[PDB]
From Swiss-Prot, chain B:
This is Photosystem I reaction center subunit II, chloroplastic. Belongs to the PsaD family. It is found in: Plastid, Chloroplast thylakoid membrane. The keyword Kinase does not apply. The gene is psaD. GO terms for cellular component: chloroplast thylakoid membrane; photosystem I reaction center. It comes from Chlamydomonas reinhardtii (Chlamydomonas smithii). The chain holds residues 53 to 195 of 196 of the full protein. PsaD can form complexes with ferredoxin and ferredoxin-oxidoreductase in photosystem I (PS I) reaction center. PSAD may encode the ferredoxin-docking protein.
Swiss-Prot record, chain D:
The keyword Plastid applies. The gene is psaJ. This is Photosystem I reaction center subunit IX. GO terms for cellular component: chloroplast thylakoid membrane; photosystem I. It is a single-pass membrane protein. One of its GO terms (biological process) is photosynthesis. The chain crosses the membrane at residues 7-27. Coiled coil: none annotated. It comes from the Eukaryota. Belongs to the PsaJ family.
From Swiss-Prot, chain F:
The gene is psaA. The chain crosses the membrane at residues 6-28. The chain holds residues 431 to 537 of 751 of the full protein. It is found in: Plastid, Chloroplast thylakoid membrane. PsaA and PsaB bind P700, the primary electron donor of photosystem I (PSI), as well as the electron acceptors A0, A1 and FX. PSI is a plastocyanin/cytochrome c6-ferredoxin oxidoreductase, converting photonic excitation into a charge separation, which transfers an electron from the donor P700 chlorophyll pair to the spectroscopically characterized acceptors A0, A1, FX, FA and FB in turn. Oxidized P700 is reduced on the lumenal side of the thylakoid membrane by plastocyanin or cytochrome c6. The PsaA/B heterodimer binds the P700 chlorophyll special pair and subsequent electron acceptors. PSI consists of a core antenna complex that captures photons, and an electron transfer chain that converts photonic excitation into a charge separation. The eukaryotic PSI reaction center is composed of at least 11 subunits. This is Photosystem I P700 chlorophyll a apoprotein A1.
Curated annotation (Swiss-Prot), chain G:
The gene is PSAF. The lineage of its organism: Eukaryota, Viridiplantae, Chlorophyta, core chlorophytes, Chlorophyceae. Keywords: Chloroplast, Photosynthesis, Photosystem I, Plastid, Thylakoid, Transit peptide. GO terms for biological process: photosynthesis. This is Photosystem I reaction center subunit III, chloroplastic. It comes from Chlamydomonas reinhardtii (Chlamydomonas smithii). GO terms for cellular component: chloroplast thylakoid lumen; photosystem I reaction center. The chain holds residues 63 to 227 of 227 of the full protein. The keyword Chloroplast applies. It is found in: Plastid, Chloroplast thylakoid lumen. The keyword Nucleotidyltransferase does not apply.
């Protein structure tokens, strides 16, 4: 499945640059981006980002640009939801780009 | 008030059987028994799973974990307004009373229960972990 | 009841669950969290553990030597070292098929063997070894050395030899000795070896134990040394017609200053290596006579630190109180050591490829790739551990009252500025590097490669031209023929240095373009973000606004509950944890850049990198997709070849990485209820409830499964890239 | 329609309007000045 | 059998006119994969005007649905005992929705 | 809810059983073909796991118009078997064979 | 000839790339009619390509061995050899706008701090105030340096820090 499906049938999506299907290659790469971006939310936890955020809020307070709506890290449930959303979006869109770029050319 | 002795003659609610009941922990280490006197027959919710019918009068119920007994305790206290009291039973027959350990429920004062594990300082007045280093076991500065 | 395995922790030995086993496997070397541990006993157990690590290292080198001597072809490799492959060891796999035995029979062997990519062949050939007997003897000697170190570790655990605590806290004599003897006399003896053995063996003359008291390293022995006529030792260097290992164009000098590369090995001369280690030896021996010992002269480091307080207290109390801070803290010294070791491991990597020391290296491409990727990933892990132990210092060893006003407290006083500025740098670099890469991607997609943001790295090119690379025409310092830096070193290193740096066939100061610009800025992104995470964890190790009592919970604790909005991955341990991902990504970018630049150099196709590396579909297609062609065809339904092991390993790492995803995304509480169901199933299944556990099945804890997912992740990352590297480089070359 | 104009003053509607305006401005700039790689004019 | 189904034209703004591929029929656009052309041929459309009026009918029906939501919330909203007539809802969704709908589509 | 433990325990066991006997087959083939033992793989050639039930159903629906659906002129799909329909040179639909690979992927 | 780069006006790979792209577009063009929408579109794209290449070659860009224009980020090398409008001038062209955005945001925040419910003027934008500040913030460098010189740009250490500062 690596060789003869995911590597062989990927020749149409990664060489689509400069052609009509180039947007498919773009959404290939961007979907690979979003999928991996999801891993920032799935592998991590809120308590790190709250402390990073408050060290940033210190810099905003120092320059008198701290917002009235207090910046919080996303909920735990929200972190998992964002992560699964970006994961599904990126993976499904990677598959979408790969499928369509392959099959519009060879089919 | 005095510590009540567990009555084994107390009947149990009408339950049709589950799979969330007792395990080998009951036979080996410990299990728990919760009792309460009901005014009517009410279908309550078992913490193990499924619904059982409590009996009019006293009831008794076995559980493998104290959290189960206190879950049912808050359910019977909040939804049915009862006053249950549970124990800890050991397989050798030793019974240990647990929840209203003074007679009244722990959120209410009793005028004579002793304060334990109370640090009389502020949480920021705790020492640094360098001062409690090499105290034998790994020890928190709260001690 | 109470168990026996965690002898070092009685709280774990009373655990009725499977958590005892894991946490005892993972608290074994945290000696300061042991039961009944004192500081002196801590230092002593660490002394013995260092002895054990030394013994293990030396046994490891002995095993490499032994297997190269036994199952390798070293006597054959020294004959034709540009066309014979290095054999690591032989394979006895009863699972092999006949095609696999037919396929792993490489390098002139009589059976299946593994092609060495560790470079030990080139190293051992450079330092004077030409025989399998030499490596056999070296293996025996290093195993005896390992035995000696093991016996010493047992010995210095004995009552009359158990060192005192102050002996460990004695830093001035340890530093003096580890600078003079361990560093400079070791370099002196290595220069003695080079001069006596390695250089004459490179000049064809065999010099072994049996004749090194009977032959001379120089035709005028030691007369030039004791009469100050030291240039006589740079008399007749090796010519450019020299061939390594024989006496064709040999030369008689032993301490030259030629610079550059040997023309036949494309590696450094052994003669300026000897002069190098000689100068290093003298400098380290003079440096080792600095600190105060039992002889009345020297420095006391506490005095240097306490005297180094600037006026205006721009540093606060200066370094007052830092001597007792570093001396009484093992995590501080460990973090400094890991910082320095990782930085010099990065130096080893960045220099061993451009200035390749070992003969017939730079022509073994897979060896170069493996060595660089290896030492870079080692450096990344070591540098992450540095900050991790800095955090553990802040928690376990830091005293705010003994560091009252010094630089180390001044860090914690302005920690928010450090974290926020590191965050700004990371944010800017990521925004802009990704933006430029996506822009070039879109321009390639829209058929217009001429609209890319191709920024010429003129700063690094200016540096290279200052080093004498005339490709860019800055004509600045060493490329300027009419300069002072050029005219002064012309009787010295310069001729070879410029012949080696203006040659575009070696890795010495490769020419760079906008792809190099973009990927160096990606490297900056990774470094700054990794150190952001790590520095943040170290500084907020003691407290945050979400948790100001974090020091009271230790280094690695799971969380502070769902309260106060949520406190998941709030420890410093989890900051290190999240930084390991960004480190693996940083080093992956680094090694991708290295491997592709060198795959295009070795194939003569640097134009492919100069064109495709400016956009990320170039990196995907022309690097990852293109160079995977032989790897994944290592085995097909038609058959297999020697790359099948690397294909299987590739898929192996792809499995392990993804398996770490399981411990990384799914968290404990789904699995604990699953295991509750399985406990019911086992207790109620007939003929199987007869068999019962002694340790209660529980799910992996939070911190534990974090570590486990990180380990599966790192192992899969590393194995996948190692397989890809070795297979895409060994498949071509 | 004080409440309706308050609604249009909300964060997402104002962001939609402002980014629609910004994107349209950049788009019309890139139409009337195609392929602006450098500042030559 | 020769012309690629396309129904999305891209504006020529920043170079994305390369996405207007040579699909066929003297056309330049994005080759759609939703299968609307086959569905329309199977419906017997054979004219772009019928698609135009179907679009206008769809917009009319959309406005009708939104008017219906506003009505059945703000003007005349049903009681709980109306929703709870699942017997009627099933009888109707089976006779008229899926029965009469299939009958009309058969017609 | 009273016997959810039995439910989930048997479901867990079947998930483990299927994971092993469906993916470890792929791992076994990877290990065999990597070791150079293609006669030890799970293939249509070495160790056949033929999907005989689905093959029988294919043949039962291919022969359906002859016996069990006499008023049908042909089968519902050409995927059961028989002749292919090719339109415009391209294959519209043709019989689909199932072998060991299909067994493994279905599992 | 800064870093060995050839100017794009005399670069050969640059011209080869122009010819390649135009050859691709005319290859697409030959399958269409004289005056059709695809033909006019491809002709317009060819003209845009020709104008783009001409304008990049006119602007004095430096091209590499690949024929692609390479930008010069160094001021001093850009100001000397006439490449300031590549990275250097657009640098300040960006920074004006970016500090303008940031200063308008800062001014809006400081403005809504004083109100009764300051958080509701952040989910619901006070568009009058926002537009007034967005118009009067065009002098953000002068006002920013004047707020900096008075000491009223930076908050004192009333900032919320942590237990170990
Ligand atoms: C972050 C990195 C980055 C950078 C530096 C650039 C830079 C650029 N891109 Mg790339 N791009 C990026 C990321 C990036 N992009 C990403 C991530 C994508 C994928 C979405 C793209 C996709 C992309 C495409 C598809 C195209 C570009 C284009 C461009 C160019 C645009 C020039 C322009 O619009 O002139 C604008 C010039 C100005 C002077 C406007 C400045 C802003 C204001 C208006 C100035 C103020 C004046 C005045 C006071 C305003 C009046 C006030 C008003 C309220 C009335 C420039 C080279 C175009 C191009 O040709 O590139 C060569 C192009 O076609 N980019
Ligand atoms: C001359 C006397 C002397 C010597 C030789 C040593 C030597 C050593 N001591 Mg000892 N020590 C001494 C005096 C001395 N010490 C004194 C006086 C004290 C008390 C005051 C101590 C107290 C002490 C403690 C408490 C410990 C040691 C330890 C060690 C070991 C350091 C670990 C190691 O192997 O890294 C040596 C590594 C290097 C030399 C490499 C660095 C050199 C350069 C910079 C690296 C780059 C080039 C590289 C070498 C190239 C490699 C190429 C190729 C070969 C691969 C080493 C064996 C530690 C140990 O291992 O315990 C057993 C330890 O825990 N020492
Ligand atoms: C610690 C390192 C070390 C050791 C143990 C030796 C040991 C020895 N050297 Mg070597 N040597 C060394 C470093 C070393 N050398 C270095 C660094 C240089 C460069 C200056 C030399 C240069 C050198 C020369 C030129 C000669 C020796 C000689 C000798 C012998 C001493 C005769 C009196 C003896 C075998 C003499 C000899 O007879 O060699 C057998 C001799 O002629 N050595
Ligand atoms: C000279 C180097 C050095 C030294 C002496 C120490 C020493 C110590 N470290 Mg530090 N550390 C180091 C390097 C070092 N570390 C590096 C390089 C890193 C970054 C990777 C860290 C990161 C780190 C953290 C984050 C923590 C420590 C901790 C500790 C302490 C206990 C270690 C422990 O739990 O043992 C037991 C450790 C293990 C059993 C390791 C788990 C297994 C590893 C991941 C290997 C798995 C690989 C796998 C088997 C490969 C299979 C391959 C196969 C599939 C083919 C101890 C003081 C801990 C501590 O002090 O607690 C407060 C702690 O929390 N260290
Ligand atoms: C592809 C995956 C990926 C990406 C993009 C990032 C990105 C980032 N991480 Mg990392 N991270 C990842 C995986 C990833 N991470 C993983 C797997 C882990 C392990 C859990 C971590 C752990 C980690 C830690 C521990 C930290 C970070 C930090 C950061 C930030 C670094 C600053 C930076 O470069 O800003 C540049 C930002 C980007 C490149 C991403 C934004 C993308 C574009 C530019 C935004 C706009 C797109 C578009 C217009 C919007 C469309 C949305 C909508 C309209 C549809 C940045 C957001 C650090 C941080 O927060 O410091 C600031 C930090 O402390 N991350
Ligand atoms: C313009 C006419 C109008 C007006 C003034 C109101 C006014 C009101 N409605 Mg009514 N309503 C209307 C039309 C109207 N409705 C219609 C047409 C429907 C049918 C859908 C409803 C259905 C309805 C329900 C079911 C409810 C209300 C409620 C309300 C109250 C507050 C609603 C609110 O917060 O709106 C602000 C909300 C919006 C602007 C959301 C609009 C969502 C639209 C319909 C869909 C857009 C989706 C979009 C395509 C997604 C794009 C994705 C993006 C990322 C690109 C208020 C009394 C609520 C109420 O009484 O609670 C007390 C309530 O529960 N309304
Ligand atoms: C490649 C990644 C990977 C792998 C191998 C697994 C594996 C598994 N998951 Mg996990 N999971 C993953 C990613 C992965 N998951 C991710 C990314 C998520 C998203 C969060 C999840 C979420 C998740 C949930 C939510 C659940 C699982 C479950 C399962 C199990 C079901 C299959 C099974 O038991 O078959 C048997 C095992 C395998 C197929 C694994 C491969 C082993 C092969 C066959 C070789 C065996 C080696 C053999 C013993 C030789 C040993 C050698 C010796 C030297 C040690 C299994 C342990 C389920 C579970 O535990 O309940 C059943 C479950 O409920 N997983
Ligand atoms: C970021 C650091 C940096 C670096 C490494 C260089 C590097 C260089 N500069 Mg530049 N330069 C920089 C920032 C930098 N510049 C900045 C911020 C300014 C002020 C705007 C200048 C202004 C400048 C001038 C005016 C000149 C250089 C020159 C030079 C060269 C000497 C060398 C290429 C000289 C040059 O033309 O090189 C040939 C020269 O005359 N630089
Ligand atoms: C957390 C912490 C820690 C850790 C930390 C770390 C880890 C750090 C690192 C750091 C690092 C890692 C650093 C690095 C640095 C570097 C440097 C500083 C460099 C320098 C350089 C130079 C100076 C150069 C010079 C020169 C040149 C330029 C070239 C040529 C030659 C010469 C020499 C001239 C500890 C434990 C301590 C504790 C506390 C806190
Ligand atoms: C799935 C889906 C879809 C589609 C769907 C469809 C297309 C459906 C259809 C449906 C239908 C198509 C329906 C129909 C219906 C109809 C009706 C409902 C009618 C009625 C009528 C009536 C009611 C009448 C009556 C009468 C008359 C008038 C005659 C005489 C008698 C009587 C009275 C009876 C889509 C993809 C888009 C999206 C997703 C989902
Ligand atoms: C990155 C990350 C964060 C930090 C993400 C931050 C808090 C929010 C991300 C961006 C927000 C949405 C700001 C974007 C801008 C605002 C919408 C306001 C608009 C202002 C202008 C840009 C228009 C978490 O809080 C988290 C929590 C639990 C598990 C994983 C994670 C996690 O991975």
């Amino acid at each position: 499945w690596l060789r003869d499906f995911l590597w062989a049938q990927s020749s149409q999506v990664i060489q689509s640059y400069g052609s009509a299907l180039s947007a498919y290659g773009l959404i290939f790469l961007g979907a690979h981006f979003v999928w991996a971006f999801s891993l920032m939310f799935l592998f991590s936890g809120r308590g790190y980002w709250q402390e990073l955020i408050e060290s940033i809020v210190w810099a905003h307070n120092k320059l008198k640009v701290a917002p009235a709506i207090q910046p919080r890290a996303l909920s735990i449930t929200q972190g998992r939801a964002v992560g699964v959303a970006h994961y599904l979006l990126g993976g499904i869109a990677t598959t979408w780009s790969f499928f369509l770029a392959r099959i519009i050319s060879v089919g | 008030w005095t510590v009540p002795t567990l009555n084994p003659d107390t009947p149990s609610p009408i339950f049709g059987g589950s799979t969330g009941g007792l395990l080998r922990k009951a036979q080996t280490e410990e299990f728990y028994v919760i009792t309460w006197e009901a005014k009517k027959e009410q279908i309550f919710e078992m913490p193990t799973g499924g619904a059982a019918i409590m009996r009019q009068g006293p009831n008794l119920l076995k559980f493998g974990k104290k959290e189960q007994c206190l879950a049912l305790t808050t359910q019977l206290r909040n939804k049915f307004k009862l006053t249950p009291c549970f124990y800890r039973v050991f397989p050798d027959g030793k019974v240990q009373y647990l929840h209203p350990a003074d007679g009244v429920y722990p959120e209410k004062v009793n005028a004579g229960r002793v304060g334990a594990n109370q640090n009389m300082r502020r949480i920021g007045q705790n020492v640094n972990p360098i001062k409690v280093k090499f105290s034998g076991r790994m020890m928190s500065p709260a001690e | 009841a109470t168990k026996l395995f965690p002898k070092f922790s009685q709280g774990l030995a009373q655990d009725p669950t499977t958590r005892r086993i894991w946490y005892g496997l993972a608290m074994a070397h945290d000696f300061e969290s042991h039961d009944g541990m004192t500081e002196e006993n801590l230092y002593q157990k660490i002394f013995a553990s260092h002895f054990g690590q030394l013994s293990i290292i030396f046994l490891w080198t002995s095993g490499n030597l032994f297997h190269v001597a036994w199952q390798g072809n070293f006597e054959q490799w020294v004959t034709d070292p540009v066309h014979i492959r290095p054999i690591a060891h032989a394979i006895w796999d009863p699972h092999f098929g006949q095609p696999a035995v037919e396929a792993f029979t490489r390098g002139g062997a009589s059976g299946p063997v593994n092609i060495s990519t560790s470079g030990v062949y080139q190293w051992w050939y450079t330092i004077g070894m030409r025989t399998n007997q030499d490596l056999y003897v070296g293996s025996v000697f290093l195993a005896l050395v390992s035995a000696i170190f093991l016996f010493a570790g047992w010995l210095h655990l004995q009552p009359n030899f158990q060192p005192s605590l102050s002996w460990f806290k004695d830093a001035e004599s340890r530093l003096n000795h580890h600078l003079s003897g361990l560093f400079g006399v070791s370099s002196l003896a290595w220069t003695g070896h080079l001069v006596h053995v390695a250089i004459p063996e490179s000049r064809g003359q065999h010099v072994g134990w049996d004749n090194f008291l009977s032959v001379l390293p120089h035709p005028q022995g030691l007369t030039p040394f004791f009469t100050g006529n030291w240039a006589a030792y740079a008399q007749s260097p090796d010519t450019a017609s020299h061939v390594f290992g024989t006496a064709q164009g040999s030369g008689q000098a032993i301490l030259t200053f030629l610079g550059g590369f040997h023309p036949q090995t494309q590696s450094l001369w052994l003669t300026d290596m000897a002069h190098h280690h000689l100068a290093i030896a003298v400098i380290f021996i003079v440096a080792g006579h600095m600190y105060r010992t039992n002889f009345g002269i020297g420095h006391r480091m506490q005095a240097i630190l306490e005297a180094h307080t600037p006026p205006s207290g721009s540093l606060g109390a200066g370094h007052k109180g830092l001597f007792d801070t570093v001396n009484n803290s093992l995590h501080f010294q460990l973090g400094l050591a890991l910082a320095s070791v990782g930085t010099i491991t990065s130096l080893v990597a960045q220099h061993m490829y451009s200035l390749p020391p070992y003969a017939f290296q730079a022509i073994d491409f897979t060896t170069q790739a493996a060595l660089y990727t290896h030492h870079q990933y080692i450096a990344g892990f070591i540098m992450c551990g540095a900050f991790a132990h800095g955090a553990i210092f802040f928690i376990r060893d830091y005293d705010p009252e003994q560091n009252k006003g010094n630089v180390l407290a001044r860090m914690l006083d302005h920690k928010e500025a450090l974290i926020s500025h590191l965050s700004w740098v990371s944010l800017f670099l990521g925004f802009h590097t990704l933006g430029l890469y996506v822009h070039n991607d879109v321009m390639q997609a829209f058929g217009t490669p001429e609209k890319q943001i191709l920024i010429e790295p003129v700063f690094a090119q200016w540096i290279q031209a200052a080093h004498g690379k005339a490709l860019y025409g800055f004509d600045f310092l060493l490329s300027s023929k009419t300069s002072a830096a050029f005219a002064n070193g012309q009787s010295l290193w310069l001729p070879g240095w410029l012949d080696a740096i203006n040659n575009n066939q070696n890795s010495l100061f490769l020419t760079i373009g906008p792809g190099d610009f973009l990927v160096h800025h990606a490297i900056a992104l990774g470094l700054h973000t990794t150190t952001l995470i790590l520095v943040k964890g170290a500084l907020d190790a003691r407290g945050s606004k979400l948790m100001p009592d974090k020091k009271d919970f230790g280094y690695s604790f799971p969380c502070d509950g769902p309260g106060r909005g949520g406190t998941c991955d709030i420890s410093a341990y989890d900051a290190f944890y999240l930084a390991v991902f960004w480190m693996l990504n940083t080093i992956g970018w680094v090694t991708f850049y290295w491997h592709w630049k060198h795959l295009t150099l070795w194939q003569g196709n640097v134009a492919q990198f100069d064109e495709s590396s400016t956009y990320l579909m170039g990196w995907l297609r022309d690097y990852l997709w293109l160079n995977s062609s032989q790897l994944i065809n290592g085995y097909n339904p038609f058959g297999m070849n020697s790359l099948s092991v690397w294909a299987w390993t590739f898929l192996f790492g792809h499995l392990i990485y993804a398996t770490g995803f399981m411990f990384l995304i799914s968290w404990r509480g789904y699995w604990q209820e699953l295991i509750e169901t399985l406990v019911w199933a086992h207790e109620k299944t007939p003929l199987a409830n007869l068999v019962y556990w002694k340790d209660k099945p529980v799910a992996l804890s939070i911190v534990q499964a974090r570590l486990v997912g990180l380990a599966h992740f790192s192992v899969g990352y590393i194995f996948t890239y190692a397989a890809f590297l070795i297979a895409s480089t060994s498949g071509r070359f | 329609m004080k409440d309706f104009t308050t609604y249009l003053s909300t964060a997402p509607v104002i962001a939609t309007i402002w980014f629609t305006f910004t994107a349209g401005l950049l788009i019309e700039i890139n139409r009337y000045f195609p392929d602006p790689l450098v500042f030559s004019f | 059998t020769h012309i690629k189904p396309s129904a999305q034209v891209v504006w020529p703004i920043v170079g994305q006119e390369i996405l207007n591929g040579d699909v066929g029929g003297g056309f330049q656009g994005i080759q759609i994969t939703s299968g609307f052309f086959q569905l329309w041929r199977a419906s017997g459309i054979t004219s772009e005007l019928q698609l135009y009026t179907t679009a206008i009918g769809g917009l009319v029906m959309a406005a009708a649905m939104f008017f219906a939501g506003w009505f059945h919330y703000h003007k005349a909203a049903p009681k709980l005992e109306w929703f709870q007539n699942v017997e009627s809802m099933l009888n109707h969704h089976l006779g008229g929705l899926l029965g009469l709908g299939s009958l009309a589509w058969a017609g | 809810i009273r016997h959810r433990d039995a439910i989930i325990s048997h479901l867990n066991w079947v998930c483990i059983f299927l994971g092993f006997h469906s993916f470890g087959l792929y791992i076994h083939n990877d290990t065999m073909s990597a070791l150079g033992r293609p006669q030890d793989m799970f293939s249509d050639t070495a160790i056949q796991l033929q999907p005989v039930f689905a093959q029988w159903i294919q043949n039962t629906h291919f022969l359906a118009p002859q016996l069990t659906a006499p008023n049908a002129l042909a089968a519902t799909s050409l995927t059961w078997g028989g002749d292919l329909v090719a339109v415009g040179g391209k294959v519209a639909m043709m019989p689909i064979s199932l072998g060991t690979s299909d067994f493994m992927v279905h599992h | 000839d800064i870093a060995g780069l050839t100017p794009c006006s005399e670069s050969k790979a640059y011209a080869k790339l122009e010819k390649k792209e135009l050859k691709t577009l005319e290859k697409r063009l030959k399958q269409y009619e004289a005056d059709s929408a695809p033909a006019v579109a491809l002709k317009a794209t060819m003209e845009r390509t020709k104008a783009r290449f001409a304008n990049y070659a006119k602007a004095g860009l430096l091209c590499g061995n690949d024929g692609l224009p390479h930008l010069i980020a160094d001021p001093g090398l850009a100001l000397k050899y006439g490449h300031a409008g590549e990275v250097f001038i657009p640098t300040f062209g960006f920074l004006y706008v970016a500090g303008y955005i940031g200063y308008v945001g800062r001014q809006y925040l400081i403005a809504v701090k004083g109100e009764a419910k300051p958080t509701d003027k952040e989910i619901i934008i006070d568009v009058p105030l926002a537009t007034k500040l967005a118009w009067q913030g065009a002098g953000w460098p002068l006002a920013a340096v004047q707020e900096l010189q008075r000491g009223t740009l930076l908050e004192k250490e009333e900032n919320i820090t942590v237990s170990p500062r």
